[PDB]
Design a protein around this nucleic acid. Structure first.
Ligand code: ZN
Lengths: 50, 106, 249, 114
RNA sequence: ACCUGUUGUGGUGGAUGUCUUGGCCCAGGUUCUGAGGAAGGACACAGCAGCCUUGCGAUACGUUCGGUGAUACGCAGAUCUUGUGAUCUGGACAAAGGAACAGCUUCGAACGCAACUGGCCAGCAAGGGGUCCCCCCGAGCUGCCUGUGCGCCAGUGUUG
RNA sequence: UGAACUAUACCGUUCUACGGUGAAGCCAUGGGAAACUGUGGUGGAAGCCGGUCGCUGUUCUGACGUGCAAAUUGUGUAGCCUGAGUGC
RNA sequence: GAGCAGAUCUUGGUUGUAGUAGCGAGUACUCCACCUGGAGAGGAGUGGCACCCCGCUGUGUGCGGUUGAGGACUGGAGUGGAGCAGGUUUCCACACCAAACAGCGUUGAAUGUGGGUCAACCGACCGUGAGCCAAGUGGUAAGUUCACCGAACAACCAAAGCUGCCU
RNA sequence: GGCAGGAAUGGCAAACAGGCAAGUGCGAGCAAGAUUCUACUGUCAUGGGCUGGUCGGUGGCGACACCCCCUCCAGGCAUCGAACCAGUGAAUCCCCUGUGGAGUUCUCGUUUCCUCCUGAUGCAGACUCACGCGGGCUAUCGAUCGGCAUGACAGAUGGUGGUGUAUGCCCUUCGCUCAGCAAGGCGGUGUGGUCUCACACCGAUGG
RNA sequence: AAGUGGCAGUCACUGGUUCCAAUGAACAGCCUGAAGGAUUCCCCUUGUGUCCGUACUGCAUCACCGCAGCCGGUCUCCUCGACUAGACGUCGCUUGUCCACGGACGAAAUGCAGCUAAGGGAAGUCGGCAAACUGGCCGUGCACCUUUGGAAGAUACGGUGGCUCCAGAGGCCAUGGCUCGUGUGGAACUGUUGCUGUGCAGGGGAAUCUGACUGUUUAAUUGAAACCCA
RNA sequence: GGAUCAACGAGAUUCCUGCUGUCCCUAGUCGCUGUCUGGUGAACCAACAACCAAGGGAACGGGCUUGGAUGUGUCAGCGGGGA
RNA sequence: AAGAGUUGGAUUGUUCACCCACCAACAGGGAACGUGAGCUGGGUUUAGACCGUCGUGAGACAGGUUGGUUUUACCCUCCUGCCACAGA
RNA sequence: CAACACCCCGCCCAGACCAGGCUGGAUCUGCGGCGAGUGUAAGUGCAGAGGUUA
């Protein structure tokens, strides 16, 4: 709902920011780097505890 | 009844985020973290769970001061491995160093 | 196996009194210079219903002993006491209904209520609906007094204990048979968590010394000892006798 | 008429408590909205002891309207005005006068019997 | 055509072989945290960055300085070269000189009181700003136990 | 460690169509020597009845029983529905 | 730490079953048009024809979305409009569905990018209630989720640090 | 620092209870927020600066009415259950007459449908004998006068003062009139270029 | 000059009335009075109003929980027209929606659901299980037994449409104008005797055992004679 | 707790009436299945297999022994068997 | 001589038993005491509860009573119909 | 190559799907008629219980 705490809102915003796919230029980093973002949540799949 | 149809009444929150351990283990009603026990000053930790200790031991966080003191200790240790320590100024050279300094600056 | 109902009650978690909306302690005005030497006047300012109690209470307002003020005490009401009554409290008070005076200024036939059990105590005896004590006798050798209590007993209390003259109001309420379970429900809902009451023969042997069996019965004498531990002290506690009471009690 | 004729809470309370009390008005824009009521307090009263009756000549104001109101809305121009009704004031006067008279009588008659 | 089989081949599958910035084991040394704020937890911080980092804190993948001495790099972009000089590295870390020793949001022993609140628009207040007042911002001080000292006291305690 | 399901106590608070029936009290009135009493209304009580929401869960021993569902389901059938009611 | 066929053995990958059982509550769709690489449907359909053209022949009751025209459902104790708890960006727009998901796929709560939430008046915040904590004191070998919460109601208690005038 | 007061530690805890104050165009204009922005129209709480002569005064028989700080105590509001009955008001809904637009018209139907609206706020007004909604109180009179009366669905009252009467007095829910305010909205009828949109006109402020 | 078109349910307020062996919070804040005391004589970060929540969902058929986009569950508010006693049930304006994997073939057998069925009427079966009968309202009327309250809607009998009339209640302006019983009774005519025409909507009676009643109960095989009650 | 007991009961039992597909004795009809189908598509189970009679045998065989059958492969059903 | 037949009911969970009838007759038996992925669930045989007797008791009871979830076939075969290939 | 069989398109005496039967100048789709089912259509002019009006 609309009612939140400032702490909860900051945490939800950080989770929104983390919910992002890897930059494209990252795989090319010489020593073989990450291909995809394995830490990526979706509101349907997995819920935040909070 | 027990299962599917009483899992729907399961809103609410016994626990919420604790401000010491950032874990959703802080019991709301009795304001007591179920993991670290926040209100009391000691951290909650029992010998009957090595894993629970492992998950909080010093070396799992920033260590933003103990890492520095440990790197200093490492510098000292890898000096003393090369050679035992020798104090630069001792009782037998203080006076010589001091009067040398005096004549040189005067 | 498991503890007993009357053993979980004494723990006092959900068996606390439902007193939130009550009026407070109903006691006689404390003993001070006025009530000891002469008399003090108080106005019966209000008669009120107290939750969980059968007798009405009375907000009675006196003056402050040493302050410019008005102390509004609250005492169980005397039957016949009305609002604006001017009750009198002290040694030189007169023998009138509602007055509070020491148990020595009372002749040996007086009917008293709100009786003290100790000096400077405040009304710990004869306080329920229609309750009254009767002053039997005085002893000046000791300064004491034999009084007959509502229970029919005869208690000796000092003649400096203060009582109130008359009956306790709200009398006659056990002379109406509760007709429904809901009446007793509402009755005890404001007193404490004690109703309904499961009987021990209807339980299982884990829950009560009476439970179990293929027929609901107690297999042992119900009359249990007085030294019985808490947990087997169920039944008739240290009963001197049993059965129908006939002739004398 | 416009947008229907059903209504909706406009404040942060969706429980039919004694403090919501919507009013269901119709707006200039042919709409239909709610306006919330306010509690009308009982105004001053005589003491519970002396009969709990309302005192005339004073208007019912909430707390802060009372704080900011003119003096005529709050007071009456009699003794104990706004705190007692004229009848209670009268019995107070008469009881006081007659009891002082009896006090005089008794003290002078005891100084006589001296 | 279907089935069974045998080869060849192609798929599905990840066994094998070989290795390994990893573990495990033994021996030696040290044990070097914290009210000057620890260990942990949050929220922040990158031109293109989500994660990770014993990265870092509004000076935020880094600041001063030393050692080194032309890179760094997945893209670009101006700085940089017989040099105050790229990069990497050293506990903000060497100077033997009592020379030098920056900064570090926020909860946390967590410290004005609280807190599921960034609440009490806390009290006091150096200063800065808008116009003596007043207004806004505001460093800093205010935790408890115990010890010592200082100030003020209390007692029909002992006395003068 | 757990009272988010669930049991119970307290604090605050919410919800309860439409009918049937017709308690006390009351009004007129007939009878009677009186005590008492007949009739027509009014009134709207009850852990009263039917019944909606709702809650519960009888019966089909119906459906399903690799389900919609680790307990639900019927264009059914039932219990209660001003109270010892109900939820948050 | 040295040999496997078994231990309802452990971990992994598979097979038949089997294109099978199924994907049957909540009444329901239809027509034209546009959006398409294609969707009134063809692989060089076929004979002249030497690709144009003229003939002949075949096309599954037909993907998705959205206007419009009809047919129906919800039927105010709603499939409507608001908010609680919970969710936490799912909201909006654009691009995009040939990666995958939606038991189809020109659509979506999908994917990618970029936006959006403005308060003296609506609420938390202010206290108080049930209840709790510190303090005070006590209990314990000892920390404690040890005891007491007592302005109705405690104690073993020196808790009035505030107000008026003078200064 | 002196004097005078001052028993009884500090908090937490309800997004349903207590608790200051905002309404309309739901728009200027949003793709997405809106009692938050916007245009109007308001409301609330609170701070600072400035400019020999002192119990505020008066009217009413009364109920009461009007104009011109400090201490302590006594009260009260906040403030409180449920059900049922009656009344009034609101919006909804419906009806009659009329208007503006639309649907039907094979026949009938002065027909059928929509619209014709009004918020907070005002130290504005008329009543308040509620001569629309009802309680309380005042003054006068003094009842049952011999058949007691008044008022209610039901209650209920009355020498502890009924009925009747009047400058009657008070409070409150409203409702009504005005300002807000018709400029807005609603149902339309048009003009102008068009555009990265302003003007004109009409149509119940009905019972 | 300055209530009033109507009346239905809801809401608010007002005046009451009943219920309780039940009497239905506190605090902050605010006000009045009583008694004392004392009494120099418009402008300002459009003054201040700081801090945090503010999207959307939210009885969800896809936004939460149930492993899921699960016929389950989950808090409150508003709530139109016609029939009707109606917040039942049936249909419709406003709002929203056509989404639940579909298509052909009259579509076997079997099944799960809806209905019918001659003659008989429990002969079926452990057992009338399942289904059926009855059903609303009005008028007449109603037995045993009884704790005198009930039983009781006992059982039962008759009627019910459409149309045209006849009676029948009130209000306002001033016995006339206007409004005016969707609320009742009677009659005439009428119909292939049929009318609570649909949805909805008791079958009834007579005993034995048992628990007095109402309430409670093993969430997920037992709702009971068990528990509770007075 | 014994005995009566009005009222009440989704309690247990018995009788009567009415009514009926419960039955004699079944038939018809209809929606959704199934049935065919486009898209999608599991699991249970699985020593290997999968026609019988008798015999013997861990006394009730699919295999053994002696006989009798048996072309291979379907589709919808089916509940005897696979103790 | 085993071809065909051997019934309708009342009580009882009943096999059995016992009556009422009809009939030519109302024979006796088997098949995992045929037959529950065919049904039913009356009975035995859970958890609830009552009575009686037994036991100090919890509890026992071929003593009585009431109430109590019977799941899955789409595999193979048999059987029923249906069809093709016959190619080995 | 033809000859025939089969499929698609038609009709059912048949059928779960298949299979079976019939048919290609067949047929299909209508229209008309017959027989049947219901029970006297709309529109328009015979009585109508009564009320209403001149
Ligand atoms: Zn913690």
């Amino acid at each position: 709902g609309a009612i939140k705490t400032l702490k909860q809102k900051l945490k939800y915003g950080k989770k929104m920011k983390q919910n992002r796919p890897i930059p494209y230029w990252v795989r090319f980093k010489t020593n073989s780097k990450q291909r995809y973002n394995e830490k990526r949540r979706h509101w349907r799949r997995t819920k935040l505890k909070m | 009844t027990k299962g599917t149809t009483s899992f729907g009444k399961r809103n609410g929150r016994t626990h919420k985020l604790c401000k010491r351990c950032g874990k959703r283990s802080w019991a709301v009603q009795k304001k007591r973290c179920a993991a670290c026990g926040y209100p009391n000053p000691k951290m909650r930790s029992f010998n009957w769970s090595e894993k629970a200790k492992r998950r909080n031991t010093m070396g799992t966080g920033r260590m933003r001061h103990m890492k520095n003191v440990l790197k200093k200790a490492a510098v000292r240790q890898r000096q003393d491995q090369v050679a035992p320590h020798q104090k630069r100024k001792t009782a037998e050279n203080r006076k010589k160093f001091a009067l040398s300094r005096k004549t040189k600056l005067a | 196996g498991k503890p007993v109902r009357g053993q979980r009650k004494g723990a006092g978690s959900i068996y606390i009194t439902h007193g939130h909306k009550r009026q407070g302690q109903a006691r006689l005005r404390p003993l001070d210079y006025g009530e000891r030497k002469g008399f003090i006047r108080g106005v019966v300012k209000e008669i009120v219903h107290d939750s969980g109690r059968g007798a009405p209470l009375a907000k009675v307002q006196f003056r402050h002993p040493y302050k410019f003020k008005k102390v509004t005490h609250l005492m169980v009401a005397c039957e016949g006491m009305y609002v604006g009554q001017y009750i009198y409290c002290g040694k030189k008070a007169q023998l009138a209904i509602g007055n509070v005076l020491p148990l020595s200024k009372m002749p040996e036939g007086t009917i008293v209520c709100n009786l003290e059990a100790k000096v400077a105590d405040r009304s710990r005896l004869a306080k329920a609906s229609g309750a009254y004590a009767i002053v039997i006798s005085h002893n000046p050798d000791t300064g004491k007094s034999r009084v007959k209590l509502p229970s029919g007993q005869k208690k000796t209390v000092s003649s400096q204990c203060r009582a109130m003259i008359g009956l306790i109001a709200g009398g006659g309420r056990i002379e109406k048979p509760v007709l429904k379970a809901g009446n007793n429900y509402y009755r005890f809902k404001v007193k404490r968590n004690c109703w309904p009451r499961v009987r021990g023969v209807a339980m299982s042997p884990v829950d009560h010394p009476h439970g179990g069996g293929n027929h609901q019965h107690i297999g042992f004498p119900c009359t249990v000892s007085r030294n019985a531990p808490p947990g087997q002290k169920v039944g008739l506690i240290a009963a001197r006798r049993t059965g129908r009471l006939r002739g004398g009690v | 008429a416009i947008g229907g004729t059903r209504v909706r809470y406009r404040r942060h309370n969706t429980k039919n408590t004694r403090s919501n009390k919507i009013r269901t008005v119709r707006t200039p824009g042919s709409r239909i909205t709610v306006l919330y009521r306010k509690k009308l307090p009982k105004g001053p009263h005589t003491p519970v002891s002396l009969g709990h009756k309302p005192i005339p000549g004073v208007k019912r104001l909430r707390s802060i309207q009372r704080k900011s109101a003119p003096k005529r809305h709050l007071t009456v121009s009699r003794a104990y005005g706004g705190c007692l009704t004229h009848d209670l004031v009268r019995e107070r006067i008469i009881r006081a006068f007659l009891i002082e008279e009896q006090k005089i009588v008794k003290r002078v008659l005891k100084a006589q019997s001296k």
